[PDB]
Structure 1
Amino acid sequence: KTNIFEKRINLKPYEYPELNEYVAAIRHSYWIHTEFNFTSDIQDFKTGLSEVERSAIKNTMLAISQIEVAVKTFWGDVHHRLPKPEIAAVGATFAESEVRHHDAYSHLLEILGLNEEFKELKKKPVIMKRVHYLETSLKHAKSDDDREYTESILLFALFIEHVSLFSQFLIIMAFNKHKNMLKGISNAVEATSKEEQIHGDFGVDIINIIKKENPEWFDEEHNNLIKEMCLNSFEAESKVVDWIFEKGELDFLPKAVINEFLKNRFNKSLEAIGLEKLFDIDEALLQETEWFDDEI
């Protein structure tokens, strides 16, 4: 008789006690940027990096920080659609973790002398288009039918948190891997990724609950709509990657390699919710980022 969409006022008993484990998971992964040491990173950025490298780092941290503001809102609003106190508890715990994250990356931009980047956001059409896309998506996640709600969860929890943000974490961590630079920032990125992993995992679980409770909504037509949405998301993400590298590609982490890493994570997101892979993976391009998953 359990219906994830039906409001329950009383805190206990939980109808989904297994989902409560996500609150403990984030309490375990909890971190603030002040736990890390960025002193050497500042000098690495200001003296060690090339103009092309500085620009890629600056654009990546601006993209992470600003998008996390929207991801926070998504999680803080989930209870409006899935009005269960235990789900609301996860949502609030996740929203606060996004604030710790956006504070970390805005702090890094500040200490690197890159504060002006947020003021000029309106003048960066590629990243601002992504910002508006998420603002529009937050409106849809609030007002669209329950039948379509799995698409809002898929967008934020998977396509943004498990896919888009992971490619950005990959970009930053590649500096430590290939150049032995930005070690402190790489530690903060690793701490961020562990929390984003948890977020997407919860997104997978709630999509699977919705599918289990409402099997009639998830027909062949629905699966095709998700595949088209995934292809649209990839095309949009590839354009975000092109903007990150507007001043030039990193020879140690080319765009083709980042794009293959994205396609593979999109495939894993589809598979997690019971759908078939969409992208035919180039194993040589994918092997180039195997170190990332081994590091996490």
Structure 2
Amino acid sequence: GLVPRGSHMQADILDGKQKRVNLNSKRLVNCNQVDVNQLVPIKYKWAWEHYLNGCANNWLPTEIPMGKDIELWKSDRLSEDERRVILLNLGFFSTAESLVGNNIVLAIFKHVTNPEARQYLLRQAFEEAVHTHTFLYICESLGLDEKEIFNAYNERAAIKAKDDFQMEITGKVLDPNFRTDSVEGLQEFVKNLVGYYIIMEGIFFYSGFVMILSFHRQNKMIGIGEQYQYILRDETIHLNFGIDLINGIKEENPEIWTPELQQEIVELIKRAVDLEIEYAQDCLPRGILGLRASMFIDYVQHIADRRLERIGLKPIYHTKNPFPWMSETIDLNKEK
């Protein structure tokens, strides 16, 4: 257990040694008593593990062949109703990933005063960029009008409704005056976290996944499908991290978790469910093979219940999952 002479670096600023970080002084928010620039010693092992797991999931949209997708898209084989599902989903996702990425950088990162959690955030934000690249790649491959697709959240009411809601639940976290060192401020911050991790990534995205992966299972648009499988694998970790972060902040700041905040989070999730159901209905006015709006009523309620449970809230809908295969692809894409 012995190293040779000179294996330590020597300080010439003696008072500087006090800036070594006390592990137990570290906190997820409002931590100004220790140096946030030093990674060590790691306190939140869960955050570090999410980071390592994400790093092991590198993929690039350009590694996935689109030849069969292009051939199918350009043919007359797809019904207009099938195309409608694909186009609306691309429309929503093309900008939703940028909304998530921008929120990580511009809202979340400043207030998560912890280096190991920030490491994960940097991986997460980069993954959003990869997802955005996916939608560009799909548009270019299929010869879609890229501006029509990317502007969809400004042109289609059911998509705009979801993203206007997102803006509302973002709160004032972007404001130069926003701070998390009041009870009210930290509560607002937690609502932003619920909005992005639980609602946008955990409910809005998972519903899109069923629509697209339903095509994949029918051997239609399998290039898009494979890309969405990779996206789902990432989003599984994003969600797990977000849940851990919310639960960690609650534990360290129990005064924020009032009946009032609890009830508001429940109402926000209810509003998300209604908006996602309305979106599914816009995607499926008549339904397509293997996909009807009524199935999404049950599915969206089901997953909302699962999200509520994970952050210590009671399930409210009690519906069953009409897509058992999603759980099996969820199983295959489970975090280590």
Matched, 1:110 2:150: no
Distance 1:112 1:17 in 2: 43
Larger Rg: 2
Asked whether the equivalents of residues 9 and 85 of structure 1 are also in contact (C-alpha less than 8 Å), the reply is yes
Greater mean deviation of Cα atoms: 126-135 or 25-34? 126-135
Q: Which of the numbers 193, 210, 216 marks the counterpart of 1:153?
A: 193
Is residue 2:92 matched to residue 1:63?
Answer: yes
CA distance in 2, matches of 1:149, 1:51: 42
Residues of 1 paired with 2:36 and 2:325: CA distance?
46
Q: Which residue identity does 1:192 align to in structure 2?
A: I
Kept in 1: contact 2:305–2:317 (CA 8 A): yes
Matches of 2:124 and 2:327, distance apart in 1: 22
Of residues 211, 219, 234, the one that matches 1:171 is 211
**Greater RCO (Cα-Cα under 8 Å, separation 6 or more):** 1
State the Cα distance separating 1:205 from its structure 2 match: 0.4
Q: Residues 59-118 of structure 1, C-alpha deviation per residue, up to 9 Å, x if partnerless?
A: 101111211110111222422111212222111110110010011022212222222322
Corresponding residue to 1:127 among 136, 153, 159: 159
Q: Percent identity?
A: 23
For residues 304 and 91 of structure 2, the distance between their equivalents in structure 1, rounded to whole angstroms, comes to: 23
DSSP-derived class of the 2:248 partner:
helix
Match status 1:53 vs 2:82: yes
Structure 2 unaligned segments of length 5 or more: list them.
1-24, 180-184, 331-336
Q: Hey, what's the Cα distance between the residues in 1 that align with 2:169 and 2:307?
A: 19
8 Å Cα contact 1:29-1:195 kept in structure 2 = yes
State the match for 1:273 in structure 2: 311
Q: Using the alignment, how far apart are the partners of 1:295 and 1:38 within structure 2?
A: 21
Range with bigger deviation, 100-109 or 237-246: 237-246
- The aligned counterpart of 1:13 is 41
1:140 is the counterpart of 2:172: yes
Bigger helix fraction: 1
Deviations 1:165-213 (A, max 9, x none): 0110110110122x32112221111110010010010000011111111
* Corresponding residue number in structure 2 for 1:241: 280
> How far, CA to CA, are the matches of 2:202 and 2:276 in structure 1?
13
The match for 1:254 among 292, 307, 314 is 292
Structure 2: distance between partners of 1:228 and 1:134: 14
- TM-score normalised by L of structure 1: 0.91
C-alpha deviations, 1:18-67, integer Å up to 9, x for none? 31112211111121101111110122223221111011101101111211
SS at match of 1:14: coil
Matched, 1:264 2:288: no
Is 1:74 aligned to 2:111, yes or no? no
Do the aligned partners of 2:57 and 2:234 also contact (CA within 8 Å) in 1? yes
Return the offset for 1:140.
2.8
- Give the counterpart of 1:225 among 259, 264, 277: 264
Partner Cα distance (2:109, 2:152) in 1: 33
Deviation at 1:136, TM superposition (A): 4.5
Moved runs in structure 1, 4+ residues, more than 6 A? none
- Equivalent-residue separation in structure 2 for 1:213 and 1:226 (angstroms): 19
> Residue 38 in 1 paired to residue 72 in 2?
no
3-state DSSP class of the match of 2:162?
Answer: helix
The RMSD of aligned alpha carbons is 1.9
Which residues of 2 match residues 87-102 of structure 1 at below 5 A? 87-102=117-132
Is the counterpart of residue 25 in structure 1 residue 64 in structure 2?
no
* TM-score (normalised: structure 2): 0.81
Q: Within 2, Cα distance between the matches of 1:92 and 1:28? A: 14
Q: Answer yes or no: is the 8 Å Cα contact 2:51–2:123 preserved in 1.
A: yes
